[PDB]
Amino acid sequence: NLMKRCTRGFRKLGKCTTLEEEKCKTLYPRGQCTCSDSKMNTHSCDCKSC
């Protein structure tokens, strides 16, 4: 278990943008993966606590 594929090096954009949530979904077949952002214009995935 553990270690999935959270982000492909942190490179998503558009405040939890669709293309971002899609990046994590279409590319990563996880159950705990999705769109994750802090408070900027760029964010990434969080399928794995990284």
TrEMBL record:
Source species, domain of life: Eukaryota
Gene transcribed to yield this protein: SCR
Source species of the chain: Brassica campestris (Field mustard)
Protein name in the entry: S locus protein 11
GO biological processes: signal transduction
Keywords: Disulfide bond, Secreted, Signal
GO cellular component terms attached to this protein's record: extracellular region
Disulfide bonds: 6-50, 16-35, 24-45, 33-47
Subcellular localization(s) per the UniProt record: Secreted
Similarity comment: Belongs to the DEFL family.
Main location: secreted
